[PDB]
Amino acid sequence: GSEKMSTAISVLLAQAVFLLLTSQR
């Protein structure tokens, strides 16, 4: 955990939807 696993699990979704937008946009 810690802010480390928090920035890895959060950044993981950031990209997941990131490409989802550029594609639908």
Swiss-Prot record:
Transmembrane domains' residue ranges: 5-23
Subcellular location: Postsynaptic cell membrane; Cell membrane
Domain of life, per lineage: Eukaryota
Function of the protein: After binding acetylcholine, the AChR responds by an extensive change in conformation that affects all subunits and leads to opening of an ion-conducting channel across the plasma membrane.
Subunit structure: Pentamer of two alpha chains, and one each of the beta, delta, and gamma (in immature muscle) or epsilon (in mature muscle) chains. The muscle heteropentamer composed of alpha-1, beta-1, delta, epsilon subunits interacts with the alpha-conotoxin ImII.
Protein family (similarity comment): Belongs to the ligand-gated ion channel (TC 1.A.9) family. Acetylcholine receptor (TC 1.A.9.1) subfamily. Delta/CHRND sub-subfamily.
Protein name as it appears in the record: Acetylcholine receptor subunit delta
Section covered of the full-length record: 276 to 298 of 517
